[PDB]
Amino acid sequence: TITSYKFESVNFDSKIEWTGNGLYNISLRNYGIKTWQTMYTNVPEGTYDISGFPNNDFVSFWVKFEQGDYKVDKYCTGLCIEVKIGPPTVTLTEYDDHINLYIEHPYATRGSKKIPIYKRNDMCDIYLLYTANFTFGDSEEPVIYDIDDYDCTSTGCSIDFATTEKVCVMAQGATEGLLDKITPWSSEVCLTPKKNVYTCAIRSKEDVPNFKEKMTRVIKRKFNKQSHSYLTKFLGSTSNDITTFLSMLD
Amino acid sequence: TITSYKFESVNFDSKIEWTGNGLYNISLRNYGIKTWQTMYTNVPEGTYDISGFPNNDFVSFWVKFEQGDYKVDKYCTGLCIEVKIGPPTVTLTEYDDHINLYIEHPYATRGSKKIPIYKRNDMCDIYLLYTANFTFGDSEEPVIYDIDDYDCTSTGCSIDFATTEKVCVMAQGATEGLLDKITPWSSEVCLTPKKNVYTCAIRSKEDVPNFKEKMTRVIKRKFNKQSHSYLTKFLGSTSNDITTFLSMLD
Amino acid sequence: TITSYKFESVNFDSKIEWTGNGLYNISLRNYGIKTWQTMYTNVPEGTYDISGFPNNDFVSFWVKFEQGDYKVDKYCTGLCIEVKIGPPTVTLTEYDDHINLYIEHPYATRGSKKIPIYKRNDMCDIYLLYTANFTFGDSEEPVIYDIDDYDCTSTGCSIDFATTEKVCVMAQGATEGLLDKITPWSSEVCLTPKKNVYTCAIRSKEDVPNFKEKMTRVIKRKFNKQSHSYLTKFLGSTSNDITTFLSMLD
Amino acid sequence: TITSYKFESVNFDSKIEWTGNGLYNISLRNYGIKTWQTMYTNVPEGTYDISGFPNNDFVSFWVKFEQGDYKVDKYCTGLCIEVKIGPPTVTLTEYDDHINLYIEHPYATRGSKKIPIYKRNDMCDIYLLYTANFTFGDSEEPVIYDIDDYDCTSTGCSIDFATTEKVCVMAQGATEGLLDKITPWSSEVCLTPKKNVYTCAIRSKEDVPNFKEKMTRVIKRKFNKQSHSYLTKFLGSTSNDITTFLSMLD
Amino acid sequence: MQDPYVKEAENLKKYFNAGHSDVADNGTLFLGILKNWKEESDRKIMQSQIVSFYFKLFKNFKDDQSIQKSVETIKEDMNVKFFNSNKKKRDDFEKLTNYSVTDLNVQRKAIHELIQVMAELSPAAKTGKRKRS
Amino acid sequence: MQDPYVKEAENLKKYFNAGHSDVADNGTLFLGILKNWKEESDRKIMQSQIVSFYFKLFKNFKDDQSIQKSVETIKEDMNVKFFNSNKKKRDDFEKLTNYSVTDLNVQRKAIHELIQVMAELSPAAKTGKRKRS
Amino acid sequence: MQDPYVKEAENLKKYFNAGHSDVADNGTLFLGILKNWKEESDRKIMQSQIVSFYFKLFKNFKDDQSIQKSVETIKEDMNVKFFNSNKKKRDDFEKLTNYSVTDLNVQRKAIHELIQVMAELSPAAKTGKRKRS
Amino acid sequence: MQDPYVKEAENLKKYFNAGHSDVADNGTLFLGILKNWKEESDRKIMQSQIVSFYFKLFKNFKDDQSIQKSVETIKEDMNVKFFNSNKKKRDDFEKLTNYSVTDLNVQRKAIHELIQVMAELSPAAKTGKRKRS
Ligand SMILES: *[C@@H]1O[C@H](CO)[C@@H](O[C@@H]2O[C@H](CO)[C@@H](O[C@@H]3O[C@H](CO)[C@@H](O)[C@H](O)[C@@H]3O)[C@H](O)[C@H]2NC(C)=O)[C@H](O)[C@H]1NC(C)=O
Ligand SMILES: *[C@@H]1O[C@H](CO)[C@@H](O[C@@H]2O[C@H](CO)[C@@H](O[C@@H]3O[C@H](CO)[C@@H](O)[C@H](O)[C@@H]3O)[C@H](O)[C@H]2NC(C)=O)[C@H](O)[C@H]1NC(C)=O
Ligand SMILES: *[C@@H]1O[C@H](CO)[C@@H](O[C@@H]2O[C@H](CO)[C@@H](O[C@@H]3O[C@H](CO)[C@@H](O)[C@H](O)[C@@H]3O)[C@H](O)[C@H]2NC(C)=O)[C@H](O)[C@H]1NC(C)=O
Ligand SMILES: *[C@@H]1O[C@H](CO)[C@@H](O[C@@H]2O[C@H](CO)[C@@H](O[C@@H]3O[C@H](CO)[C@@H](O)[C@H](O)[C@@H]3O)[C@H](O)[C@H]2NC(C)=O)[C@H](O)[C@H]1NC(C)=O
Ligand SMILES: *[C@@H]1O[C@H](CO)[C@@H](O)[C@H](O)[C@H]1NC(C)=O
Ligand SMILES: *[C@@H]1O[C@H](CO)[C@@H](O)[C@H](O)[C@H]1NC(C)=O
Ligand SMILES: *[C@@H]1O[C@H](CO)[C@@H](O)[C@H](O)[C@H]1NC(C)=O
Ligand SMILES: *[C@@H]1O[C@H](CO)[C@@H](O)[C@H](O)[C@H]1NC(C)=O
């Protein structure tokens, strides 16, 4: 007789913890599928990994315990609903003209392969919207920065920024929506960059007119009079196009 | 009799300082011009402004002093050679996503009008190459930054940069070349910006591939499948063009 | 008593022709609308224009005739189904380097205004696909040319072409689809162009590589070496883009 | 004793024709070069090819004839001045949507290799400006068409054009300038194309606004509303650029 | 996409005696609604219900032999225009329309699948959320 | 778009006693079908029928007071996600689903409007036909 | 830019008896040098000296009436090709070539203007210096 | 490109006693002319003649030891700015300036090469002629 049972799943690594006397056969049935899938044969109480058996959806699955004629089924609402999502991993890398913040998505481990939990159809299409807490220098007022999903891929999110002082960062993810998954905060990482004048060619959409103004000046000083007008007309069309693309981020 | 004479010119504001008993008529002759230009009539010793009379070139001019039958001419090599250039003016302005350093060129004052000394044919075509000393936070090691002339106009030079800590700056100009003009250091200005994550759309030529990668991702997620391919092809041509323009700064 | 009745509509100019003794009140009811709209009061047999009263849709309308206590309703399936579409109008205009064929859509006359029958929501969204028969010189084998709807606007279709000999053309339209409207052939128009070498900058998508080859040669001969490479890179991106746009016509 | 001598060169195939009794040694000296180059040893009167010996420049060369102690030098002004240029070769090829006229430059034959006479430094930098006489149908008034050098390469000139009737063409070349070379007319070639409606995507610089108008319409009908505006903005910049490139042909 | 479809629709109008001026009473069933929605998605939502209405109506007259050809022709036009001639799409559609709401077993499965259906109405990876609210 | 919706869906699962392992028998009602169609238009066609199924099911239990809050919460999630919170869109939808196929008058109007409906399934000005076949 | 120029150049060759094979001795005066420089600026530097050479040579024979037409035609070709038909450009050029280096006054003016000339050889605003060395 | 060049130019001004106010008489030798031409090609044409003038002037004073360093420094600035430090370019230039117009043999070679020089003033493949006149 099963005296205690608990199902838990973190980043899709599903485990069952139970107590009972003797050995038992453990099997699982997913909603919509007729056959029970045998997971363990004649095993004693303890904690067992059952990753891969429950379907990753919003419908239920049942874990059945059998010992001779004894039989009991344990109901679970649905893995996409029950699964907990661990914290992401943050890395700070220094470059000659900027600092890169890299947020690696929490991942599922299917054997030896690490599968990022980000918009995968086989993992509830779950993806996290990240918030990063930036600590600059010795400030006691961390800056709250919301990561734009456009800066994220299946692997993680990449944010380039610049400052001349020490910076520490930690990030947290949330899915919002139907599944209200909230992750724990990642560990904090710091980095001290070199003192430098950090500049950019095109800072934002509003900076394009300055880019155009400068390049018009460069063309005028760099090339002979004859090529001036032509090159400047192409600069005009390219400037309009850069603006058009940047407007896609509005 | 003229007992002492000295000519001086700072930013083309030319003055003569002299001593002698009695009143004198003061006139000036420029190389290549036959007539003497009367500057002062029956004046006593002292300091007199003669801005505008000497030609701004590399050939000589003579200042003549007359008193009755007495006459003496004072030789000068050429104003472009003798003129001293004063220090520039630096201004630091804070914006939402960056800090602007503005270097105003030393200027000549023709009456009430301020004429910037920068590539003017009427002012020896003189222009300064600037060096700025950046002091970040409480560092004792100032950063040396050479201003690119492409960032300068007839008015001054503009440099946008980003940092989250306090910054102080002073600048100095030099013409190099035939005229070895070196200016005094400007006064130092400081500014404390707000703590923020300072980012950019396109940091440099080497950052274009990242811009292309991101925009490809944005187009794919933002528009329907049908428009995907077309928009992405235009992104490819615009990315090549941005790179081509940025290469002009190589 | 109404002894004969016939409804006809050409380009939405609807008319009823009927016979009967005495005077009658004529009214019309459209499917889905409760009230009868009085069109004529106490009128004798003949042909009457009732344009504007029948709704332009696929559901029925009834024309009611009343004389004292006598009353009779005439059923019609639906104007979009019954309407006949007249022939288009063709015009040939000569230009210095080409001949223009202009096909004006059949139009409805709402009073004094001419409304082109082309993709209008108030006119069944009807639009014709045109076929033109081109007669070149004295050939007895007319060339069949199907007009691309991309060359048509709300007003008509425009086709530019070139030949050095006499050309005559007539066109016919068809809607295909649910409404199988076929128009009569337009009248034939001819034009004799001047003898000339008719050339083009970019003939088609397949001609872009030749355009690029030629322009590369022009840039190389026209500008100095320094501007060569830059201008040629922009030519490369513009050539790719022209191809991309032309591919939209595939 | 040399009793008659004549030098002739067509397309740089230089020959000497002479008469005299006995055998002679024939050598040549070019202005600026000290040594005589032996061309023929102990040969009798006749016509001899001496291609390659005279330098292709504007300075003289001397042909020396020797027989024992007898010696006579024949002066020539300079090959670039004396050389005659043969007629070009014209070819007419039919394509699905146009006719191609190809003018092959007169060529020099250095052994087995055919070297086109077009802007070569080793051949006086000579190049011909071509004029083609087009005969359309049975007209008695040929059309005079001046070939744009931008349509020519080291191999020849290529002109694409369209007409539905028979066309015959012949071409003639002239260098103008210091060397007043005029070639004989080429042989005439004809071609009868198929009857077809010959159209173009972009006819000329003045046709770009029509290209833009049409493509705006295509984009609006082909893609969903969301992508409309973006694609149309890129069309605007590409249209400006096509115009800019075409203006290079002004 | 042809004249035959119109011809058969008219034959049905005659058979059902739906050509009298009084039929026009009480506005319309589908005309006004279809006019209110032009976005493709909204149109499909409404058309799906109109198409199922017609299939059910036709099913209720599968005995009248005289109009069977008319009905078959109309249904084919719908298979072509609404289902894009995709037999699997039509079969799935018909499967959905035949589920019985009074069948106790069907009810349990429907209730059990409710959360997944809700998740399907607003696809997670498809909801353009870029930043945390 | 929240935890409350899941909570109420689960409450309904309990109320309907739809949490037994045998409920999973006979594949699924909607899960497989929704998986077969990813194009937005095809999805709307199927979802429209699934949504009308649920509204009808809920209507058949408007008496059970105990689950009324659960039902009201679910319906609201559907109004938000499927109808985009547009009340007119929902009202038109509900109007379509309530038309009776056995009502003789409704039948005549449906048959009368058939040709216009067919014309609406394949909008003329929207059918990308560029040249004559 | 014509046959007449060639004709007159040849007439001069005859007049100067410069058509004998021994004239070719000792390489060339201008041919090799003009071949060494293709950049427009370098060419102008060399051509300027060659053109002044010819003007001086022609000046030394302004008495021979028989060849005056030949000389005048050659000079005109040079005015057109080298001076671009600009009379002011030709006059300034000729002014420069006539200054005497032995004239004490000319010497003083030349020495006095030396620094400005040096500044003109490397125009300040034209030297593409972008940053401090 | 330095202060030493100015220093030596000034030393020469003193040596030649060219610092008196009366030196300024009669406009200028080179200042006005250099001001009239801004196009690079026109400038080179004029500068070439001014540079040859100075080389000849300096040559006429190769004995005065006291100013030899000044002269050598000036010539070096010219080698750098006008000849771009190219020794071959300077040697060809100097070769041209040394040809004697009175040497009968030089005269014959010059006349003989006249047509080629004329052809070099207006390079055939470089004259942008696109169509027949
Ligand atoms: C876990 O599942 C296994 C597999 O079903 C169970 O083992 C099976 O147990 C049955 C009943 O004890 C065995 O059947 C017996 O077979 C013998 C031999 O023919 C026959 O004489 C008996 O009358 C009876 O039919 C079956 O052989 C056995 N299968 C094997 C190969 O092990 C096991 O009992 C389950 N464990 C628990 C905790 O319930
Ligand atoms: C500064 O320059 C002024 C202007 O040249 C000098 O004034 C001029 O001085 C001369 C000689 O003293 C004056 O000439 C005299 O004129 C009177 C009147 O006709 C005549 O009787 C005398 O014989 C003599 O020619 C001249 O008038 C005077 N000009 C004026 C209007 O002031 C002045 O002397 C100079 N100052 C110095 C410090 O040298
Ligand atoms: C066409 O329609 C008009 C408008 O309805 C018809 O005229 C109307 O005819 C009725 C019956 O003849 C008239 O009613 C009579 O009114 C008088 C005056 O009060 C009353 O004494 C009679 O007992 C009767 O009610 C009505 O006045 C008249 N309307 C007008 C203003 O003309 C007409 O008869 C129809 N024509 C045909 C061909 O049916
Ligand atoms: C064409 O040129 C050839 C090559 O120079 C001439 O042949 C050479 O003619 C000379 C004089 O007749 C020969 O010189 C003689 O050599 C013999 C042998 O040593 C010597 O005994 C004589 O006293 C005299 O020096 C030379 O050998 C000969 N070269 C060869 C190898 O053929 C030829 O004469 C010229 N032909 C004409 C038409 O002028
Ligand atoms: C991030 O900043 C917020 C804003 O006050 C703060 O409450 C929070 O503690 C910070 N992150 C953590 C948990 O360190
Ligand atoms: C700028 O930095 C240099 C580098 O050591 C330093 O010597 C200089 O003093 C700084 N500028 C000044 C004069 O403050
Ligand atoms: C157009 O060409 C077809 C092809 O044979 C011909 O049958 C038809 O008569 C022509 N158009 C008319 C009716 O003139
Ligand atoms: C080309 O046209 C001209 C114009 O009249 C004519 O004189 C000439 O004969 C034609 N070409 C030849 C020679 O056939």
Conformational region of residue D20, where left means phi above 0, alpha means psi within -120 to 50, and beta covers everything else: left
Nearest CA-CA partner of C231 in D204, H126, D245? D245
What would the 3-class secondary structure string for chain A be? CEEEEEEEEECCEEEEEEEECCCEEEEEEECCCCCCEEEEEEECCEEEECCCCCCCCCCCEEEEEEECCEEEEEEECCHHHHCECCCCEEEEEEECCEEEEEEECCEEEECCEEEECCCCHHHCCCCCEEEEEEEECCCCCCEEEECCHHHECCCEEEEEECCCCCEEEEEEEECCCCCCCECCCCCCEEECCCCCCCCCCECCHHHHHHHHHHHHHHHHHHCCHHHHHHHHHHHHHHHHHHHHHHHCCC
Nearest CA-CA partner of B228 in C94, D7, D231? D231
Which pair of structure tokens corresponds to residue D15?
């020959």
Whether F69 contacts E111, CB under 8 Å: no
Whether A201 contacts B246, CB under 8 Å: yes
What are residue B250's DSSP bridge partners?
none
Which pair of structure tokens corresponds to residue B125?
């075509």
Judged on CB neighbours under 10 Å (0-12, 13-18, 19+), H34 is buried
Tokens 């007309």 -> residue: A233
Which pair of structure tokens corresponds to residue H69?
């360093």
Q: Whose CA is nearest to atom 7 of ligand 6?
A: B142
Per-domain residue ranges of chain F: 1-133
CB atoms within 10 A of CB B23: 13
Write the DSSP symbol of residue E27.
S
End-to-end CA distance of chain C: 60
Cα(C209)–Cα(C207) distance, rounded to whole angstroms? 6
Over its C-alpha atoms, chain H yields an Rg (Å, rounded) of 19
Whether F123 contacts E14, CB under 8 Å: no
Q: How far is A148 from chain E (nearest CA, A)?
A: 5
Whether A18 contacts A5, CB under 8 Å: yes
CB contact under 8 A, E131 and A149: yes
G88 touches chain H (CB under 8 A): yes
Tokens 């080497």 -> residue: B206
- Cα B115 to Cα A221, B110, B158, G103, G125, distances in angstroms: 21, 7, 18, 42, 17
Q: Which ligand is nearest to the CA of D184?
A: 8
Whether D245 contacts C217, CB under 8 Å: no
Cα(C59)–Cα(C39) distance, rounded to whole angstroms? 20
- Phi and psi at residue B141, in whole multiples of 5°? -115, 90
Ligand 4 atom nearest to D22, measured from its CA = 38
Cα(E109)–Cα(A198) distance, rounded to whole angstroms? 61
C227 touches chain A (CB under 8 A): yes
Judged by DSSP in three states, E68 sits in helix
Whether G17 contacts H108, CB under 8 Å: yes
Q: Which residue of E has its CA nearest to C36?
A: E21
Is the Cβ atom of B41 under 6 angstroms away from ligand 2?
Answer: yes
Nearest CA-CA partner of D183 in D114, D112, D117? D117
Q: How far is A125 from chain E (nearest CA, A)?
A: 6
Judged by DSSP in three states, C38 sits in strand
- Phi and psi at residue E96, in whole multiples of 5°? -55, -50
The chains found to touch E (3+ Cβ pairs under 8 angstroms) are A, C, F
Judged on CB neighbours under 10 Å (0-12, 13-18, 19+), C215 is buried
Is the Cβ atom of D40 under 6 angstroms away from ligand 4?
Answer: no
Over its C-alpha atoms, chain C yields an Rg (Å, rounded) of 27
Cα(B127)–Cα(B121) distance, rounded to whole angstroms? 11
Cα(A30)–Cα(A61) distance, rounded to whole angstroms? 4
Contacts of H123 in chain D (CB under 8 A): 125
Is the Cβ atom of A185 under 6 angstroms away from ligand 5?
Answer: yes
Is the Cβ atom of B24 under 6 angstroms away from ligand 2?
Answer: yes
Q: How far is A177 from chain F (nearest CA, A)?
A: 4
Alpha helices in C64-163 (DSSP H): 79-82
Nearest CA-CA partner of F25 in C153, A35, D23? A35
Nearest CA-CA partner of H29 in C177, G38, G120, D26? G120
Residues 6+ apart with CB under 8 A from F86: none
Q: F17-20 long-range contacts, Cβ below 8 Å, gap at least 24?
A: F17/E108, F18/E107, F18/E108, F18/E109, F18/E111, F18/E112, F19/A60, F19/A75, F19/E112
Cα(H5)–Cα(F2) distance, rounded to whole angstroms? 82
Who among D126, D148, D178 is closest to H130 (CB)? Answer: D148
B37 touches chain H (CB under 8 A): no
D33 touches chain G (CB under 8 A): yes
The chains found to touch F (3+ Cβ pairs under 8 angstroms) are A, C, E
Whether A230 contacts A236, CB under 8 Å: no
Whether C205 contacts C192, CB under 8 Å: no
Q: Which residue of E has its CA nearest to A249?
A: E130
What would the 3-class secondary structure string for A17-37 be? EEEECCCEEEEEEECCCCCCE
Judged on CB neighbours under 10 Å (0-12, 13-18, 19+), G100 is exposed
Q: How far is H85 from chain G (nearest CA, A)?
A: 13
Whether E15 contacts E67, CB under 8 Å: yes
Buried b (16+ CB within 10 A) or exposed e, A27-65: bbbbbbeeebeebbeeeebeeeebeebbbbbbbbbbbbb
Who among G18, G82, G115 is closest to H9 (CB)? Answer: G115
Buried b (16+ CB within 10 A) or exposed e, C96-134: ebbbebbbbbbbbeeeeeebbbbbbeebbbbbbbbbbbb
Is the Cβ atom of D68 under 6 angstroms away from ligand 4?
Answer: yes
Whether G34 contacts H92, CB under 8 Å: no
Cα(H26)–Cα(H31) distance, rounded to whole angstroms? 12
What are residue A20's DSSP bridge partners?
A2
Judged by DSSP in three states, H87 sits in helix
Residues 6+ apart with CB under 8 A from A219: A228, A231, A232, A235, B248
Residue B42 Cα to ligand 2 middle (Å): 11
Judged by DSSP in three states, G53 sits in helix
Q: Which ligand is nearest to the CA of D186?
A: 8
Q: How many residues does chain E have?
A: 133
Tokens 């071509």 -> residue: D130
Instruction: Output the DSSP codes for H22-82.
Output: GGG-SS-SSHHHHHH--SHHHHHHHHHHHHHHHHHHHHTTTT-STTHHHHHHHHHHHHHHT
Is the Cβ atom of D163 under 6 angstroms away from ligand 4?
Answer: no
D223 touches chain B (CB under 8 A): yes
What are residue C73's DSSP bridge partners?
C64
Buried b (16+ CB within 10 A) or exposed e, B211-246: bbebbbebbeebbeeebbebbbbbbbbbbbbbbbbb
CATH class of the domain at F1-133: mainly alpha
Ligand 1 atom nearest to A68, measured from its CA = 39
Cα(H14)–Cα(H20) distance, rounded to whole angstroms? 10
Cα(C58)–Cα(C75) distance, rounded to whole angstroms? 13
Which pair of structure tokens corresponds to residue C156?
């008509």
Buried b (16+ CB within 10 A) or exposed e, H119-130: bbbeebeeeeee
Contacts of C204 in chain D (CB under 8 A): 97, 200-201
Conformational region of residue C125, where left means phi above 0, alpha means psi within -120 to 50, and beta covers everything else: left
Cα(F77)–Cα(F82) distance, rounded to whole angstroms? 8
**Which of F112, F114, F132, F133 is most worth mutating to test chain C (most C CB atoms within 10 A of its CB)?**
F132
**Which of E72, E89, E121 is most worth mutating to test chain F (most F CB atoms within 10 A of its CB)?**
E121
Judged on CB neighbours under 10 Å (0-12, 13-18, 19+), F40 is middle
Q: Which residues line ligand 7 (CB under 6 A)?
A: C 133, 142, 144, 185
Q: Which ligand is nearest to the CA of B188?
A: 6
Q: Which residue of A has its CA nearest to E111?
A: A59
Cα(D233)–Cα(D239) distance, rounded to whole angstroms? 10
Ligand 8 atom nearest to D144, measured from its CA = 2
Whether A1 contacts A23, CB under 8 Å: no
Cα(H53)–Cα(H60) distance, rounded to whole angstroms? 11
Contacts of H77 in chain G (CB under 8 A): 118, 121
- Phi and psi at residue B76, in whole multiples of 5°? -140, 140
C240 touches chain A (CB under 8 A): no
CB contact under 8 A, D176 and H133: yes
Which pair of structure tokens corresponds to residue D151?
């349509």
Cα(E131)–Cα(B84) distance, rounded to whole angstroms? 57
Tokens 């070939």 -> residue: D147
Whether B193 contacts B164, CB under 8 Å: yes
Contacts of H110 in chain D (CB under 8 A): none
Ligand 2 atom nearest to B41, measured from its CA = 1
Q: Which ligand is nearest to the CA of D44?
A: 4
Domains defined for chain C, CATH in brackets: 1-83 (2.60.40.10), 84-194 (2.60.40.10), 195-250 (6.10.140.1480)
Cα(C107)–Cα(C13) distance, rounded to whole angstroms? 10
Cα(E70)–Cα(E11) distance, rounded to whole angstroms? 7
Instruction: Output the DSSP codes for D15-56.
Output: EEEEEESS-EEEEEEETT--S-EEEEEEE-SEEEE-TTSS-S
Cα(B163)–Cα(A196) distance, rounded to whole angstroms? 9
Tally of CA atoms within 13 A in the half-sphere of D245 that contains its CB: 31
Who among E119, E130, E133 is closest to A148 (CB)? Answer: E130
What would the 3-class secondary structure string for C134-157 be? EEECCCCCCEEEECCHHHECCCEE
What would the 3-class secondary structure string for chain B be? CEEEEEEEEECCEEEEEEEECCCEEEEEEECCCCCCEEEEEEECCEEEECCCCCCCCCCCEEEEEEECCEEEEEEECCHHHHCECCCCEEEEEEECCEEEEEEECCEEEECCEEEECCCCHHHCCCCCEEEEEEEECCCCCCEEEECCHHHECCCEEEEEECCCCCEEEEEEEECCCCCCCECCCCCCEEECCCCCCCCCCECCHHHHHHHHHHHHHHHHHHCCHHHHHHHHHHHHHHHHHHHHHHHCCC
Write the DSSP symbol of residue D205.
G
What are residue D89's DSSP bridge partners?
D104
Q: What is the resolution of this structure in A?
A: 2.2
- Cα D195 to Cα A9, C135, D164, D169, D250, distances in angstroms: 75, 9, 5, 19, 32
Alpha helices in chain C (DSSP H): 79-82, 208-222, 225-247
Is the Cβ atom of B144 under 6 angstroms away from ligand 6?
Answer: yes
CB contact under 8 A, G110 and H57: yes
Which pair of structure tokens corresponds to residue A202?
């095109």
Judged on CB neighbours under 10 Å (0-12, 13-18, 19+), D175 is buried
Cα(A3)–Cα(A20) distance, rounded to whole angstroms? 5
Cα(G73)–Cα(G54) distance, rounded to whole angstroms? 13
Write the DSSP symbol of residue D195.
P
Which pair of structure tokens corresponds to residue C64?
């009611």
Q: What is the dihedral of CA B233, B239, B241, B245, to 10 degrees?
A: 170
CB contact under 8 A, F131 and C149: yes
Cα(C170)–Cα(C112) distance, rounded to whole angstroms? 27
Inspect the structure and tell me whether chains G and F have 3 or more CB pairs less than 8 Å apart.
Answer: no
Question: Residues E10, E13, E19, CA angle at the centre, nearest 5°?
Answer: 110
Whether F26 contacts A101, CB under 8 Å: no
Write the DSSP symbol of residue C193.
P
Residue B68 Cα to ligand 2 middle (Å): 9
Cα(C205)–Cα(D199) distance, rounded to whole angstroms? 12
Q: How far is E126 from chain C (nearest CA, A)?
A: 27
For the four alpha carbons of G47, G49, G55 and G60, in that order, the dihedral sign comes to negative
Q: How far is E25 from chain C (nearest CA, A)?
A: 6
Cα(D91)–Cα(D156) distance, rounded to whole angstroms? 11
Is the Cβ atom of D69 under 6 angstroms away from ligand 4?
Answer: no
Q: D207-213 long-range contacts, Cβ below 8 Å, gap at least 24?
A: D207/C160, D207/C201, D208/D239, D208/D242, D208/D243, D208/D246, D209/D239, D210/C160, D211/D239, D211/D242, D212/D236, D212/D239
Whether D163 contacts C163, CB under 8 Å: yes
Cα G84 vs. chain centroid, distance in angstroms? Answer: 13
**Which of G105, G109, G126, G131 is most worth mutating to test chain B (most B CB atoms within 10 A of its CB)?**
G131
Residues 6+ apart with CB under 8 A from B165: A136, A137, A163, A164, A165, B136, B137, B192, B193
Pairing status of strand C167-174 against strand C129-136: antiparallel
Cα(A148)–Cα(C217) distance, rounded to whole angstroms? 46
Residue A61 Cα to ligand 1 middle (Å): 26
- Cα A160 to Cα A196, C139, H40, distances in angstroms: 16, 71, 46
